[PDB]
Symmetry: none
Subunit: 402 residues, 2 copies
């Protein structure tokens, strides 16, 4: 029930910008940020470059920091991470919706398809956070303030941070924070990622995993480990013949959508054409169908300093020591409390634990079934169906790496 | 050895008889199978029990002579066991059937029954009657073939029935029996085993079996994941073994790589290969999609068996069968011989039934391989080719 209290900061969202539910409105926004945040990163990159990140992590972390911002800083956050798209809702409210979305998204239960949230903001031992910033982050986001001795044992903290992401990401993401990133002037830094585990609902067979070639953006030749399989999946052929396909995970609430353009016909043009609408409209039109599926095995890693993107985008004040309005952290007072940096790392390795061979007796399909050869650059999304929240996003343009 | 097995005895690590025999059976099974395959089309069904057959004719042999008794020891591969005589086979076959149906205690239900339907008015050798009612537990039952043939065929068919817990009915066709009929030997086997690791209903979906060279059809596939003995042999041929609860009875599957003609594999079958496959199998962690289906097959053994070698036996002017009806050879030949089998695979387990019947004097006339095997004895009980899981 509505408990996260707030003072005199609360910004008013404009009265403007399929049931009526907080989590749905929230997810609708989160998706709009994500799709755009991606359209930018993308446009900045090389066409032959893999891209992988968790928008739901970013969008989540910043909305927590925001629990302690005010005046111009607060507006800016809410304006960048689209939370104001939720017509009429006051800023404080946003956190309640978050709680609600967070409740039914993370836990130690059910069909082992895991989701562990690593979102934490480290500040120097010379920072006493507002007693409420505290209670509410812990409650609504399940996080801490975590005082680190940034000035003295500067490197020790840096490490200590990284030595913490690893233990939560079961050792996979480690050096979330890079080299010259932390020094004596690291008042406070924000780290976050999401680790996820899950097994295919219809695993591929290693025995059929061949060695066909991938057709890059410019290079037209690459040897990838292509996985073979035919079975029933939600699929569809959309505008300009773009193929959309969904491969559910055992933990049903989570799936993996991919989008393949006709005869290459540039992932780029298809990348530029996006919107949560073009997207949902796509997702709506998928019906079960029996077909052949090809997919390379792939592992992609990406880490970064959000700063550069988030400012170009509109989130400046949070970073300016001169403009950052951070009342939530009265370590001392106005005392230029701003945000040093905020890090994110994303990891997805894709397989066929692998040895589980596969046998099928007495299946004899239509000689005329649609196929799906992902031997070209494609998009990747990892959605959470009942919640309708885009958790990761990606582009696989080089599935060889050798 | 004590069994006073008599008349017509013909005569042609490294020794254990019962095995030599099981193995002998097996070499017959594959070959008989191969001919059956041939009169049949590669994408049609085939289910049978080359164990019942070996038996029904093993007990017929009892009363055959000269050229008959010979051809039978040869085609049913009896002259492969060594350093023994024609009358000894039944001693072994007797102990095989002894060690076979007594196994697993109260897990796997494997059971057999044999019986003779002889005419009421005739007198049969008292030895025959005993040696049969002894080595193979077959008690003879007096039927009126001359006055009312039909009702006898009925009563006969209905024998097979309570024996096969309801699955085998029309073993004997409507026009098989007649007034001239002397005897009718019969075997029936039954088995109902539970899967050591059952499939669950919740997980079973209805795939589409678009029939090759034809129309659309509706399949019902089960699925489960677990540890099993498997191996992917030469040419892509997958070979999986499914342990039944009665740990010694176990179904074996053989599927060719992504449909590259089964006939090709059927044509290279021998108990050697089939032994090798089973030999080099290895316990894998894997996923299975077995169709839940039911199939019934039936046919006359006559034709194939002739091509195989049993000619004399089905000939009016030469089948040497003196010891049956005691007095003489009369017109003792086999006008025909029939078989009918039944398979039912499902979440819980598998169910097969079979019954062979030989008539003495009367009138004349895709996917994969399945295999129910008895491990210790190495006896292929039932066997077949599945090519239509939907069947409604």
């Amino acid at each position: 029930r509505d408990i996260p209290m707030n003072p005199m900061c609360i910004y008013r969202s404009p009265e403007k910008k399929a049931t009526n539910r907080r989590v749905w409105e929230l997810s609708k926004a989160n998706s709009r940020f994500a799709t755009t945040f991606y359209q930018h990163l993308a446009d900045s990159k090389n066409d032959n470059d893999n891209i992988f990140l968790s928008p739901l992590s970013i969008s989540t972390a910043f909305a927590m920091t925001k629990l302690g911002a005010c005046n111009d800083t607060l507006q800016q956050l809410m304006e960048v991470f689209k939370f104001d798209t939720i017509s009429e809702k006051t800023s404080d409210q946003i956190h309640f919706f978050f709680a609600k979305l967070n409740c039914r998204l993370y836990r130690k239960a059910n069909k082992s398809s895991k989701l562990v949230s690593a979102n934490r903001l480290f500040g120097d031992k010379s920072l006493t956070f507002n007693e409420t910033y505290q209670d509410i982050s812990e409650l609504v986001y399940g996080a801490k303030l975590q005082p680190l001795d940034f000035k003295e044992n500067a490197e020790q903290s840096r490490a200590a941070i990284n030595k913490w992401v690893s233990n939560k990401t079961e050792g996979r993401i480690t050096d979330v924070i890079p080299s010259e990133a932390i020094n004596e002037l690291t008042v406070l830094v924000l780290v976050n990622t999401i680790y996820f585990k899950g097994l295919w609902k219809s695993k591929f067979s290693p025995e059929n995993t061949r060695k066909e070639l991938f057709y890059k953006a410019d290079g037209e030749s690459c040897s990838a480990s292509m996985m073979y399989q035919e079975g029933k999946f939600r699929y569809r052929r959309v505008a300009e013949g773009t193929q959309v396909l969904e491969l559910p995970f055992k933990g049903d609430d989570i799936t993996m959508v991919l989008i393949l353009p006709k005869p290459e016909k540039s992932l780029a043009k298809v990348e530029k054409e996006l919107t949560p609408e073009v997207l949902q409209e796509w997702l709506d039109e998928l019906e079960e169908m029996m077909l052949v599926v090809h997919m390379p095995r792939f592992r992609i890693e990406d880490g970064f300093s959000l700063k550069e993107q988030l400012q170009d985008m509109g989130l400046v004040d949070l970073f300016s020591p001169e403009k950052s309005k951070l009342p939530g952290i009265v370590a001392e007072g106005r005392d230029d409390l701003y945000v040093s940096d905020a890090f994110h790392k994303a990891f997805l390795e894709v397989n066929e634990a692998a040895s589980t061979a596969v046998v099928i007796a007495g299946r004899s399909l239509n000689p005329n079934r649609v196929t799906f050869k992902a031997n070209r650059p494609f998009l990747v999304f990892i959605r959470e169906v009942p919640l309708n929240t885009i958790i990761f996003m990606g582009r696989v343009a080089n599935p060889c790496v050798k």
